[PDB]
């Protein structure tokens, strides 16, 4: 996957997180991306390894 610049690999699943309208993606503790927002549909998706 690539989400507007974020290059990575993983499984995409429906999330239950809530981003602040200005945030595009989230990171977990230990500073690794764990959720993104689809640029086209504007939905939050978790990334499992």
């Amino acid at each position: 996957f690539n989400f507007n610049g974020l290059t990575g690999t993983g499984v995409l699943t429906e999330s239950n997180k809530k981003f602040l309208p200005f945030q595009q993606f989230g990171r977990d503790i230990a500073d690794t991306t764990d959720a993104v927002r689809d640029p086209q549909t504007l939905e939050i998706l978790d990334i499992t390894p």
Binding site: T7, I29, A30, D31, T32
Partner: protein, 45 residues
Amino acid sequence: GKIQDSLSALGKLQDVVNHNAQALNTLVKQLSSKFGAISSVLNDI
């Protein structure tokens, strides 16, 4: 019966958990270091 009152101690057991959690949190964080290279990502290079 007084033993429960003194509990409701186990810091020696929490320290074991903490020491391993800290080594695993540090091991992952050390991947975001350039070590004097142009970048820290083997694909971007």
